[PDB]
Amino acid sequence: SDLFNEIIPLGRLIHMVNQKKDRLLNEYLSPLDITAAQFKVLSSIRSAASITPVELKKVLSVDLGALTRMLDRLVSKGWVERLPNVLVKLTTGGAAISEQSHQLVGQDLHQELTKNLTADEVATLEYLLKKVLP
Amino acid sequence: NEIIPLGRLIHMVNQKKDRLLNEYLSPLDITAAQFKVLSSIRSAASITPVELKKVLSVDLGALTRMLDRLVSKGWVERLPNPNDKRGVLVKLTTGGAAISEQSHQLVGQDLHQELTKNLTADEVATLEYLLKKVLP
């Protein structure tokens, strides 16, 4: 709590808290040699069903090159398949691992993130974060 | 509209910040990802790629590519390492300083005002307060 003495801007706070989330993800996901970054790519493909690398790049806001490397690794692991249109989609086993991740990682991440918060502080934080998104 | 977990909300709000950064930074052909790298070097003054990878939590390979691009643009320079010699320090050129220095205005003003457009002043103070409480 040099943080409460000091005035840190909101954008910086959002960044730091997102770093903390990603470190916690990386820890809980570690039992599948899947990174937080790979996890997000898988989730994005899951919700889109099928999606261009070009379209995926745009949804994720990351470099096209860096994403091709990500997609290479995820195909080698059998979690993603490349189809003729290019279009990337989840394998049946990448669907499994997406499913296992979410069940493995939720609750735990929520409880570690909110450990210092009151129940109503959690509800307020969630409320106000939603208000930023419109 | 529904009950979205905190972790997910943090992600979505962080995505939104990055998209706004990418828009405002577009007049330099500099990405939010690049801008973060420059800021990290700024505050470290000089830093290993290995130490930088750790501070940024990105792949070493992907960071070497980032650093290649920023050297070609003249915002970062590679130096001989005093302790290693087979290795290098990166630091900002004066141009890279001028650009990373713009992080005060960008994150604190423009980006800040777009993020908080739907918030009351006290709602901003509360959101900041509670985000700080997650960090310990």
> Is the minimum CB–CB distance between A8 and chain B shorter than 8 Å?
yes
Inter-CA distances, A4 with A114, A123, A128, Å: 17, 20, 19
Quick count: other Cβ atoms within 10 Å of Cβ B48?
17
**Does A110 contact B14 at a Cβ distance shorter than 8 Å?**
no
Mind telling me how many Å the CA of A50 is from chain B's nearest CA?
21
Domains in chain A, number: 1
Element of type H or E holding B26: none
Of B6, B108, B124, the CB nearest to A125: B6
Are the CB atoms for A62 and A114 separated by under 8 Å? no
Q: What distance in Å separates the CA atoms of residue A88 and residue A55, rounded to the nearest whole number?
A: 10
Quick count: other Cβ atoms within 10 Å of Cβ B51?
14
> Is the minimum CB–CB distance between A108 and chain B shorter than 8 Å?
no
Quick count: other Cβ atoms within 10 Å of Cβ B72?
9
A9 is written with which tokens? Answer: 């801007």
Which CATH number belongs to the domain containing residue A121 in this structure? 1.10.10.10
Length of chain B as a residue count? 136
Q: What distance in Å separates the CA atoms of residue A76 and residue A30, rounded to the nearest whole number?
A: 18
Q: Which residues contact A15 (CB under 8 A, 6 or more apart)?
A: B14, B17
**B8 → chain A, closest CA residue:** A21
Resolution for the entry shown, Å:
2.6
Q: What distance in Å separates the CA atoms of residue A35 and residue A45, rounded to the nearest whole number?
A: 16
- Running DSSP on this structure, what letter comes out for residue B29? T
Helix/strand/coil (H, E, C) string of chain A? Answer: CCCCCCCCCHHHHHHHHHHHHHHHHHHHHHHHCCCHHHHHHHHHHHHHCEECHHHHHHHHCCCHHHHHHHHHHHHHCCCEEEECCCEEEECHHHHHHHHHHHHHHCCHHHHHHCCCCCHHHHHHHHHHHHHHCC
- Nearest-CA neighbor of B15 among A58, A101, A83, A89? A58
Are the CB atoms for B56 and A37 separated by under 8 Å? no
Q: What distance in Å separates the CA atoms of residue A38 and residue B104, rounded to the nearest whole number?
A: 31
Question: What DSSP string runs through B68-84?
Answer: HHHHHTTSEEEEE-SS-
User: For chain B, where are the alpha helices, taking DSSP H only?
Assistant: 6-24, 32-44, 49-56, 60-72, 94-100, 103-105, 111-115, 121-134
Of A61, A66, A124, the CB nearest to B130: A124
**Does B19 contact A133 at a Cβ distance shorter than 8 Å?**
no
Element of type H or E holding B90: strand B88-92
Mind telling me how many Å the CA of B83 is from chain A's nearest CA?
30
Tell me the residue type at A127.
Y
Are the CB atoms for B49 and B63 separated by under 8 Å? yes
**B6 → chain A, closest CA residue:** A126
Q: What distance in Å separates the CA atoms of residue A101 and residue A4, rounded to the nearest whole number?
A: 34
Give the structural domain span for A20: 1-134
Inter-CA distances, A45 with B16, B27, B131, Å: 19, 31, 29
Ordered strands of the A80-83 beta sheet: A50-51, A87-90, A80-83
**Does B130 contact A117 at a Cβ distance shorter than 8 Å?**
yes
Q: What distance in Å separates the CA atoms of residue A3 and residue A54, rounded to the nearest whole number?
A: 40
Q: What distance in Å separates the CA atoms of residue A123 and residue A121, rounded to the nearest whole number?
A: 5
Of B5, B57, B124, the CB nearest to A110: B5
Q: Which residues contact B110 (CB under 8 A, 6 or more apart)?
A: B24
